[PDB]
Design an enzyme around this catalytic site. Structure first.
Site, PDB file in Angstrom:
ATOM      1  N   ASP A  35     -13.063 -31.509   5.396  1.00 29.91           N
ATOM      2  CA  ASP A  35     -12.213 -30.373   5.062  1.00 29.91           C
ATOM      3  C   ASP A  35     -13.026 -29.247   4.422  1.00 29.91           C
ATOM      4  O   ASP A  35     -13.313 -29.288   3.226  1.00 29.91           O
ATOM      5  CB  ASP A  35     -11.112 -30.830   4.108  1.00 29.91           C
ATOM      6  N   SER A 199     -13.145 -11.231   9.884  1.00 35.37           N
ATOM      7  CA  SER A 199     -13.147 -11.007  11.317  1.00 35.37           C
ATOM      8  C   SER A 199     -13.008  -9.516  11.601  1.00 35.37           C
ATOM      9  O   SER A 199     -12.373  -8.775  10.847  1.00 35.37           O
ATOM     10  CB  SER A 199     -11.996 -11.796  11.956  1.00 35.37           C
TER      11      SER A 199
END
EC number: 3.4.23.22
Length: 330
Positions: A35, A199
């Site tokens: 994770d 992004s």
């Protein structure tokens, strides 16, 4: 040193991925959920409340000649999906794919929430976010990666998740045969303890690319792609009959649909998520309403590039002095 381990979807939907991990002496192999959105290595154990164990493999520290109680240490964690676990702490030898760390904090669960009990395939979590998020008190502990780093050939790990197929976690090296083209690297902020990056925009299907900054985290422990409501609405508007359902808890679409791809930007590069990766199947057994793999982050407080996004790429988690993230097509 290096390590290399195969990671395998837990079910036909790729709800999560499990990777075998050796703990203790002699080895006890547990299948852990790696994770990159948390920083605790915790396991089902001989200490876990009996009624909360249902099929998991447990770690038994009393059977490990290298286990030592970390006296006075406790831990307690809550995840974004509302699940939680807590307990006490041992140090022991932990190996992943041939890479060994001695003295790793292994957090033994005394209690786990129902979601964990109900998932017989996940024996615990191995956190790979920054150690500043680790929950051990009163002495915070380091992640497996942080402990291994100095010994690694290169201070990196990579995630290469499969779509309905096994994939790979590598430690200490970049497998140049595992991706196509070049790797594009992008800046990371560690201020919130995550692999947080920005992004450069998105496209829906064959549509034009929208240049827009989207801050979010690379999180292997989250199944879906969670993005701003504007972006998610633009995606689902291209699917006939798709709608946001408050009763179901997100966007659903007719199971008869063919889903468009979704592209996200990494610098000047582009990662394309095929439409099929965005199908999470019937909302309930036999339903003709299907659950979407792109959902709104509104009310989470952060955008999450979870498995839906990451499995479309070869992803480099660069833990050099100034961390960065790399993405390549594959």
């Amino acid at each position: 040193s290096t390590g290399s381990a195969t990671t395998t979807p837990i079910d036909s939907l790729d709800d999560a991925y499990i990777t075998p991990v050796q703990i203790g002496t002699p080895a006890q192999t547990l299948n852990l959920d790696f994770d990159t959105g948390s920083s605790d290595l915790w396991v089902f154990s001989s200490e876990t409340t009996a009624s909360e164990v249902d099929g998991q493999t447990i770690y038994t520290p009393s059977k490990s000649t290298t286990a030592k109680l970390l006296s006075g240490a406790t831990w307690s964690i809550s995840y974004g999906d509302g699940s939680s676990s807590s307990g006490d702490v041992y140090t022991d030898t932990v190996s992943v794919g041939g890479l060994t760390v001695t003295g790793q904090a292994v957090e033994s669960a005394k209690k786990v929430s129902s979601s964990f009990t109900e998932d017989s395939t996940i024996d615990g979590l191995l956190g790979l976010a920054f150690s500043t998020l680790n929950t051990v008190s009163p002495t915070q502990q380091k992640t497996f990666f942080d402990n291994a780093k100095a010994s690694l050939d290169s201070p990196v790990f990579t995630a290469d998740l499969g779509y309905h197929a096994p994939g790979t976690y590598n430690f200490g090296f970049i497998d140049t045969t595992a991706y196509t083209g070049s790797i594009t690297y992008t800046a990371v902020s560690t201020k919130q303890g995550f692999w947080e990056w920005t992004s450069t925009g998105y496209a829906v299907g064959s549509g034009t690319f929208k240049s827009t900054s989207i801050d979010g985290i690379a999180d292997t422990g989250t199944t879906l792609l969670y993005l701003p409501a504007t972006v998610v609405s633009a995606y689902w508007a291209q699917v006939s009959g798709a709608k946001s359902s408050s009763s179901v808890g997100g966007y659903v679409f007719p199971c008869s649909a063919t889903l468009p791809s979704f592209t996200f930007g990494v610098g000047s590069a582009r990662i394309v998520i095929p439409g099929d990766y965005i199908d999470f199947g019937p909302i309930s057994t036999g339903s003709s309403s299907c659950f979407g793999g792109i959902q709104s982050s509104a009310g989470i407080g952060i955008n999450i590039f979870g498995d839906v996004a990451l499995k479309a790429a070869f992803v480099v988690f660069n833990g050099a002095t100034t961390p960065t993230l790399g993405f390549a097509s594959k």
